[PDB]
Symmetry: D2
Subunit: 249 residues, 4 copies
């Protein structure tokens, strides 16, 4: 309670899964939240669900003009940003031999390019002492079959947390990466060819993890809140794994 | 909302520095805390500063019988442990060429051996679903002049969080390491004598860290609280660096 | 004993710097080498310096058709590949605020996209039991001012060694990253203009590294040879830092 | 061939497994080798096997006086040391609840204490520009059931490589850690309660590793040779995993 009181947050990827659970938690802690995403359907569905202190903004983070519009709205509506959660992301599986230019470009566009311009165009509004959270992944430190581009892109994300720590330290802005393991959301199964493989995919993910289950979206939200909040005021440039121990043992 | 409401915490090295700040934060978050240390005077003084919901216990973690007594007291007063913060430790500087058997044993006995037995002997009281935090250090991943044994001991600590992740996962107990950078406590002045030398040492630590300051004990406590609390319920086996970015750039 | 006797190596960016030094060492160790680069003049010059057992190939790794031609030439002349060193890359410095789409694409196209296709298109010629080395960089684990895209790209490279470990293990092909610190090549002077500025930049790099000097290209080649050779036959997926200790202390 | 020509090496743990295969390779590359260990039986068996340019020295590295005697012999016989491979080590499995003081002390004595004094007492003989290799383990970065003390001790070893890089850089002495995965030697099965579990233990180890087999002692020797040799002249403070990709994917 009150841990983000009166703070303005911007969450990309905000209309589902992790970004929605994060928006919900941020609002519970007193924040005003912008949720950003491409589908106006979900975005208003979501803003209703969250219920208070949330504005939806339609934008494709891969498009520079869409980002200019987002931040024009943030500037008009709230004046500044305290917390940026740059959370837009997407996974498509292809093995090395399967990779096509289009598959590479889609992967890097949403996971890296758009993330870079998301943060760049936030900087004029971000308050000194603000907090930026990037969504990397466990994939960024693993060797997962057919995750070639996605894992590489998520390793690039984690790298940007280090560089931006150095670049933004003079403004006391903290930049940290969160690296989720298996989280129960559409990202896990916007992949599987049926609904047969959806339950047995999660059983594998559970079996691979020390805690022995997939995480809830709310648990990832809570770790993001840690990095957003003043409780992490001496935490900078880190990679916070939230993966039930998957990468740690 | 109180994030440790009615939880029982045991903190070794809770009469000074990080451990004391953590005890104060835990009590603000509704916990009952045992603080543990060798010095009776600083224990009484710490208990008074905390002011409520605290029992001080004199125990040397390097003596097994002192641990057995600590845990009989916890058992009698509270019945079970929710959170254990194995935090006692000490730094003495010697180069490789200056190391003696006594120096080696002094460092390893409190920082590693004592920590192992602190946790082993908590196991019968730890609740399923409980949280264990070990204090490692940035030194565990650096090559600092004349910190041979201390750094090596703190790397051993970080290792044990991984092993204990694996061994305690059946009881759903999470074990995580926290690795402070420079935090403003008596530990920082381990190798200096005058007020000038101490101020100078802190200035150098500030200049070495991206955030450009020494961390406050309350900031370390807040990160420990993360790990103690339900916010980190999908976090296991990690090393959480709280060092202003020092190890991350 | 010649450690690559009669082996066929393909080196991208083999007309300058690390790639050239590696070609010379490989030829001294009995290999036949293809060096690959865009500039015809430097190719001819490099081939002459190497002096034997070398074919130079003009190819831009960022153009798929240039890779297809490279591999048709390898196929015609040698028939198969034992060692592939995907080494071409380039650094341009921009801060986050200065990044443009063009700069982003220039960095990622050669350092990541080109490297992916370089390896993908080698697969049909690579022998089972072959060795692939990727050039990452210390920048992949640091937060260096104004190296946003380059560092992120080099982290992506390191990631791909892990994925390709997993995907190519059935053919027993080893894939390893090498991560140079400061090596004395044209790459080091990417952001300077005069002879003074270059000398100064090298002095700073020397002072930053524990060994207290910039590495020679021949030292990087020797580490690549490790990874290429049978000495590293139980080494897979790694990141081999060759940086005088810079990232390790 | 000739890669350690006329160099003096000292190998602890030298009469079996990794240390013997290393002594054999070092001799093939032109070195004069001291092999050190407790059992005079094996040590002469081994020195015979190696066949040339090897002296056996009986010493228990846990005993300071035994180390003084070793280095008195090295001084008399050869005058100086070029390469030190501090390779003495031992694993006994116990879970946290099983740990006894004696089990901790045995583990830390041989893996950490003796290693520290081994290197300390070498320093007067070690040449400037010499090379020291420490045997850590994959266990030092994993969470392996019942490997509590061993893994922690091997993480302490890896730490000492960083510290000693800093302390010895002025002498241009390089210090690196090698971290073997499963290697086919008595260390693997000086553990199993029969000979039934010996073959099925190795099948598990094989199944866990990307290369899909256990390593040979000669392969670990070859990686040690890399770090001993001038091919690693710009490598300092590293952890070289030689584990068929076990820890990397
Ligand atoms: N197991 C896991 O769930 C897991 C593991 C590792 C990492 N992650 C990462 O966590 C982040 C969130 O994913 P999730 O698990 O919550 O899955 P999700 O439910 O599919 O959410 C992903 C979000 O990204 C948004 N997004 C995608 N492309 C976008 C674009 N071009 N512009 C703006 N927003 C866009 C989506 O909204 P629209 O479609 O409406 O734009 C969606 O809300 C991603 O970066 C993901 O890769 C998840
Ligand atoms: N910059 C930093 O401050 C920093 C950096 C990295 C890690 N650390 C770690 O942080 C932890 C807390 O230290 P601190 O900075 O808060 O310094 P501190 O104020 O000196 O606290 C050390 C605490 O440990 C207790 N202690 C020491 N030896 C003990 C023993 N044998 N048995 C019982 N308790 C013992 C001390 O109390 P008694 O003397 O009364 O027993 C004291 O409460 C330590 O593990 C330290 O190594 C600190
Ligand atoms: N300190 C360092 O030197 C250092 C540090 C970390 C990592 N690295 C990495 O080391 C690798 C070697 O660079 P270096 O230091 O040896 O610098 P360099 O002498 O400039 O060599 C770069 C090489 O890559 C080639 N190249 C560049 N773009 C290419 C393209 N699109 N297609 C084909 N070839 C291309 C260049 O030749 P053309 O221009 O003729 O094509 C040249 O042969 C690079 O990946 C670099 O990022 C270097
Ligand atoms: N899978 C693996 O094999 C693996 C994995 C991770 C790490 N390692 C490490 O590799 C190193 C060598 O082991 P290995 O695999 O070759 O097993 P090994 O065949 O049992 O060899 C271990 C060596 O350590 C020596 N040693 C033990 N205690 C000693 C003491 N107090 N003083 C002097 N020397 C002593 C032994 O000789 P004496 O009994 O004659 O003294 C023996 O030659 C060890 O540090 C080990 O922990 C091995
Ligand atoms: C040994 C590491 C640690 C933290 C201090 C740092 C951490 C490393 C950076 C630093 C640089 C300085 O001046 C160059 C002075 C201090 C420091 C201490 O000393 C006390 C305990 C803790 O473990
Ligand atoms: C960007 C990293 C890298 C290596 C140089 C370093 C590596 C980091 C340390 C360093 C400090 C300096 O002065 C403070 C100057 C140079 C350096 C280059 O620039 C060229 C390519 C290579 O990737």
């Amino acid at each position: 309670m009150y841990r983000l009181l009166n703070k303005t947050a911007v969450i990309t990827g905000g209309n589902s899964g992790i970004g929605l659970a994060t928006a919900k938690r941020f609002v519970a802690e007193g924040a005003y939240v912008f949720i950003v995403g491409r589908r106006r359907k979900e975005l208003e569905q979501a803003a209703a669900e969250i219920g208070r202190n949330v504005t939806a903004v339609k934008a494709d983070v891969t498009k520079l003009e869409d980002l200019d519009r987002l931040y024009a709205i943030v500037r008009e509506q709230r004046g500044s940003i305290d917390v940026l959660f740059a959370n837009s992301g997407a996974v498509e599986q292809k093995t090395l031999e399967e990779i096509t230019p289009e598959h590479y470009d889609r992967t890097f566009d949403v996971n890296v390019r758009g993330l870079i311009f998301t943060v760049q165009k936030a900087l004029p509004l971000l308050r000194d002492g603000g907090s930026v959270i990037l969504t990397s992944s466990v994939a960024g430190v693993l060797g997962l079959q057919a995750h070639d581009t996605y894992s590489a892109a998520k390793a690039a994300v984690r790298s940007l947390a280090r560089t931006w720590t150095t670049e933004l330290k003079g403004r006391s802005i903290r930049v940290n990466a969160v690296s989720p393991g298996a989280i129960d959301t559409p990202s896990l199964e916007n992949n599987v060819s049926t609904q047969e493989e959806a339950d047995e995919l999660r059983a594998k993910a559970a079996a691979a993890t020390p805690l022995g289950r997939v995480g809830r979206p709310e648990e990832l939200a809570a770790a993001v809140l840690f990095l957003a909040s003043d409780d992490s005021s001496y935490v900078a440039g880190i990679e916070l794994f939230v993966d039930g121990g998957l990468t740690q043992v």
